[PDB]
Amino acid sequence: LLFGYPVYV
Amino acid sequence: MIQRTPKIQVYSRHPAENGKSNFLNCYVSGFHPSDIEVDLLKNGERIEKVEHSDLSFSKDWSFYLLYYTEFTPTEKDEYACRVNHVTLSQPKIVKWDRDM
Amino acid sequence: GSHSMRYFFTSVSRPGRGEPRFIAVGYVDDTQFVRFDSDAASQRMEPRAPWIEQEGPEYWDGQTRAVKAHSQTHRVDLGTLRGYYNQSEAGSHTVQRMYGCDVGSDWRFLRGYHQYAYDGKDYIALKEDLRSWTAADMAAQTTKHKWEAAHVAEQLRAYLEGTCVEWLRRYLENGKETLQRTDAPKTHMTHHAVSDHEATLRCWALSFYPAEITLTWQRDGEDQTQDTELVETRPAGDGTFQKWAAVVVPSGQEQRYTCHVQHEGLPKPLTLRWE
């Protein structure tokens, strides 16, 4: 199951 | 920018036996960037119905793909894989050797 | 035995030819189970192993939503990295991302990962403590600082240690026929003459799962490492793997050489000889 939170570089 | 040459292996799914259905595979790996051109050849001509695996990559970030098509080998038909990529000046052709 | 789940994402900018190409794939050990391709017609996360096909519409709808959210963050990332590296709008660039978890042979959490590369090189990686970041580039520091301040590691720690391994365990149970199987290598040798005074002995391992395998040659029981041609383990296309190893055997010397095969599927390691 994918990670559910947005990550931006 | 980083550019890594594809390694190429051309081979069948099952041990090749004339008159028995099989899959001809061209495995390309270790390459960067991901744009690559891969064709399967039957007696020198591009085979039209050729599928590929979903792009993925190894621990060192280099990509790998399997290109494949259903075929039935015969004594006389020759097969090969032809690859072009930014690291290759001209298309690299690897012949199928029913022994590699 | 030990198991892993990993997701792999590739986003490639295509200046003048639309939105970035985005591909996501998920694996449990060496078995692919999901895919998303932004160029495909469905626009959905899709099954790639039979055991995941029975998960149901809540799963597929929610994994389609999450994977599209990952696409969009990489779309923004390409623009961010171009700025960071003072790169032109003309060139195509690549972001890659991998995350996931390992469990040990007790099926307890063992290790977690979350890492990025830009144009083929390490950009940023979560450290093994899941609390700190490794960042080599100057440009990458900006990301590290942003992430330290937003407590991204803490959020990632909770996922990798909890959700990630719980869902790995669910998959292991649901795909037990596929994932908890081993296929032992089926082996053989071939012999081909180079010339009159030497020949190539090739030891083959076919139809094995998982991919990890050791194939070596010895000559009078001495390892022949420098003189063995070994090819990369390759997929057969049916979920199994293939590998070979060859030595050049001068005339009358076939009996000196043994090929040694180690693999989880074997009840004991094999010693093969041409005879």
Peptide linkage before C210 cis (omega within 30 of 0):
yes
Tell me the C-alpha distance between B16 and C216, whole Å: 25
**Distance of alpha carbon C44 from the chain centroid:** 22
First to last CA, chain C: 35
Chains that touch C (3 or more CB pairs under 8 A): A, B
Tell me the C-alpha distance between C121 and C136, whole Å: 10
Tokens standing for residue C124: 């940023």
Q: Does domain C1-181 have CATH number 3.30.500.10?
A: yes
Tell me the C-alpha distance between B68 and B91, whole Å: 18
Q: Which residues contact C200 (CB under 8 A, 6 or more apart)?
A: C191, C192, C194, C246, C247, C248, C249
DSSP state letter for C181:
-
Q: Which of C94, C39, C36 is nearest to C66 (CA)?
A: C36
DSSP for C45-75, written as a single string:
-EE-SGGGTTS-HHHHHHHHHHHHHHHHHHH
* Beta-carbon count within 10 A of C273 CB: 13
Q: Mark whether C and A touch (3+ CB pairs within 8 Å).
A: yes
CB C126 within 8 A of CB C112: yes
Q: Which residues contact C93 (CB under 8 A, 6 or more apart)?
A: C12, C13, C78, C81, C82, C87, C118, C119
Parent domain of B75: 1-100
Nearest to A1 among C123, C124, C163 (CB): C163
Q: What stretch of H or E contains B17?
A: none
CB C254 within 8 A of CB C234: no
* Beta-carbon count within 10 A of C241 CB: 22
CB B79 within 8 A of CB B41: yes
Contact assignment for C119 to B33 by CB distance below 8 Å: yes
Enumerate chain C positions whose Cβ falls within 8 A of a Cβ in B: 8, 10, 12, 23, 25, 27, 32, 35, 37, 48, 92, 94, 96, 98, 117, 119-122, 190, 192, 202, 206, 231-232, 234-238, 242, 244
Q: Which amino acid is at C179?
A: L
Nearest to C99 among A3, A4, A8 (CB): A3
Q: Which chain A residues are Cβ-neighbours of C114 within 8 angstroms? A: 3
Q: Which of C216, C215, C207, C214 is nearest to C181 (CA)?
A: C207
Number of domains forming the structure of chain B: 1
Structural domain boundaries in chain C:
1-181, 182-270
Three-state SS for A3? coil
Q: What stretch of H or E contains C160?
A: none
Tell me the C-alpha distance between C241 and C26, whole Å: 18
Q: What pairs with residue B23 in β-bridges?
A: B70
Domain covering C182-270 in this structure, CATH number: 2.60.40.10
Q: What pairs with residue B37 in β-bridges?
A: B84
CA-based radius of gyration for chain B: 14
Peptide linkage before C47 cis (omega within 30 of 0):
no
- The CATH code of the domain that includes B74 is 2.60.40.10
Tell me the C-alpha distance between C257 and C239, whole Å: 31
Asked if C11 reaches chain A (Cβ–Cβ under 8 Å), the answer is no
Q: Mark whether A and B touch (3+ CB pairs within 8 Å).
A: no
Which residue in C has a C-alpha nearest to residue B65's C-alpha? C235
Strands B56-57, B63-71: parallel, antiparallel or unpaired by DSSP? antiparallel
CB C121 within 8 A of CB C19: no
Q: What pairs with residue B64 in β-bridges?
A: B29, B56
Residue C187 — φ and ψ, nearest 5°? -115, 155
Tell me the C-alpha distance between C16 and B59, whole Å: 31
Tokens standing for residue C186: 């089926």
